[PDB]
Amino acid sequence: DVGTVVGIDLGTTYSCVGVFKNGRVEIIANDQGNRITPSYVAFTPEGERLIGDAAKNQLTSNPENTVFDAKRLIGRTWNDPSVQQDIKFLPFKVVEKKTKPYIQVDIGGGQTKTFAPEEISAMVLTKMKETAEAYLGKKVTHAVVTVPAYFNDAQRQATKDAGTIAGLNVMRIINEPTAAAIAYGLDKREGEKNILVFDLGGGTFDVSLLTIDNGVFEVVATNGDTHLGGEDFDQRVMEHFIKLYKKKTGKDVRKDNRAVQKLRREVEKAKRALSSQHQARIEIESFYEGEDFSETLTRAKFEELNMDLFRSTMKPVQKVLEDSDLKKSDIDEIVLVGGSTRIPKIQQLVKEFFNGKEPSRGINPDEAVAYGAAVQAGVLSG
Ligand SMILES: N#Cc1ccc(COC[C@H]2O[C@@H](n3c(NCc4ccc(Cl)c(Cl)c4)nc4c(N)ncnc43)[C@H](O)[C@@H]2O)cc1
Numbered sequence: 268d269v270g271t272v273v274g275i276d277l278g279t280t281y282s283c284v285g286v287f288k289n290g291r292v293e294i295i296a297n298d299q300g301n302r303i304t305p306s307y308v309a310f311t312p313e314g315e316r317l318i319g320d321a322a323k324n325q326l327t328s329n330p331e332n333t334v335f336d337a338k339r340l341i342g343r344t345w346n347d348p349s350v351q352q353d354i355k356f357l358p359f360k361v362v363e364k365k366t367k368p369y370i371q372v373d374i375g376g377g378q379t380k381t382f383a384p385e386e387i388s389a390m391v392l393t394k395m396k397e398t399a400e401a402y403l404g405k406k407v408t409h410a411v412v413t414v415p416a417y418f419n420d421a422q423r424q425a426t427k428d429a430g431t432i433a434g435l436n437v438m439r440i441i442n443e444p445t446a447a448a449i450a451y452g453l454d455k456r457e458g459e460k461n462i463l464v465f466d467l468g469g470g471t472f473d474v475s476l477l478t479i480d481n482g483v484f485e486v487v488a489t490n491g492d493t494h495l496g497g498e499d500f501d502q503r504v505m506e507h508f509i510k511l512y513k514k515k516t517g518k519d520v521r522k523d524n525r526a527v528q529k530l531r532r533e534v535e536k537a538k539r540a541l542s543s544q545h546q547a548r549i550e551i552e553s554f555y556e557g558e559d560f561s562e563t564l565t566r567a568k569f570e571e572l573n574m575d576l577f578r579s580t581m582k583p584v585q586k587v588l589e590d591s592d593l594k595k596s597d598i599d600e601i602v603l604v605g606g607s608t609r610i611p612k613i614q615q616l617v618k619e620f621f622n623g624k625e626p627s628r629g630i631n632p633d634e635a636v637a638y639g640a641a642v643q644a645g646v647l648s649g
Pocket residue numbers: 281301303468469470496497498535538539540542605606607608609610633
């Protein structure tokens with residue numbers, strides 16, 4: 268009946284699925300060979316739905332009908348101030364329907380359709396379910412799904428509802444920082460500890476203070492920045508190169524959406540290289556007006572352009588400690604989650620804040636949450 272329960276991190280920008288099979292957690296790659304699937308859905312004018320990288324890669328060509336960031340809207344009402352602010356930054360249409368922010372898209376043949384946020388998340392969960400079934404060689408009916416620790420009752424229920432729509436019985440809703448702590452085996456220890464989970468992803472920043480007492484977790488405080496992540500650091504670098512190009516050539520490349528997207532792709536790759544080396548060459552064939560682009564970005568320049576944003580991650584950490592009535596020295600483990608925690612300056616700032624205390628390392632920060640969800644899914648599969 269419940270079979271092999273899957274563990275899914277349903278992220279704002281990226282989702283990840285794991286299972287417990289043959290004595291260990293296995294993070295599952297999708298049909299594109301990727302252990303992460305972008306939380307994107309594109310509606311083509313042929314009536315087809317594209318999910319994941321297939322959808323993300325077609326954003327520039329179909330900017331009104333490619334849906335992403337549905338997690339920012341799920342479990343909220345249309346008139347929630349957070350929703351009214353977020354819709355200002357989203358390129359697809361959002362309308363009031365049944366008190367909620369429904370996403371409106373063209374599906375071809377002169378038809379437009381509206382989808383609740385949980386229906387978009389259900390499409391992402393269906394893909395995660397397909398990924399898991401291809402791996403296991405059998406059907407998947409049950410899941411453990413993670414949510415941000417600050418999610419309220421409506422946000423947790425709407426996430427279980429996205430599972431129902433996808434044909435998944437969401438047996439447990441688990442907090443993302445708790446799932447990361449479980450990945451590190453922090454739940455399998457005698458005694459009591461205070462854990463700070465610092466999660467800096469592609470688009471969001473979450474800090475959580477947890478207590479662990481002989482396998483029992485409590486989320487004591489949460490903070491962060493809802494609109495700070497890796498995409499913001501790429502954007503600072505894009506603006507930098509766009510201004511330098513305008514001063515050198517007198518050309519504003521922002522007029523050509525394709526040129527901007529080629530630059531975005533290469534800037535993101537260069538930022539990644541800058542986590543292990545000190546210079547990165549950005550090369551673009553036929554960037555603008557058919558002319559090739561070839562420039563270098565140093566790690567020093569990358570840090571300067573982003574120094575305020577990197578430093579900003581420190582105030583939510585201090586605030587969670589104040590709200591927990593804990594001192595820096597009371598923190599027993601610092602767990603880094605989210606792909607942006609690979610940035611050396613971010614790791615430096617976290618270590619400096621904690622007076623030289625080394626954070627927990629070793630588990631891929633993009634996968635730690637799904638890994639913890641898979642550990643719990645293994646217990647439930649029996
Ligand atoms: N393949 C793949 C893939 C794996 C994980 C992710 C999730 O990334 C979340 C965020 O994390 C960022 N990030 C990541 N993300 C992981 C990643 C690894 C490989 C690839 Cl091809 C891509 Cl593109 C992304 N690695 C970073 C690094 N070394 N230095 C700085 N930032 C890094 C990334 O730019 C994004 O903003 C996205 C794609």
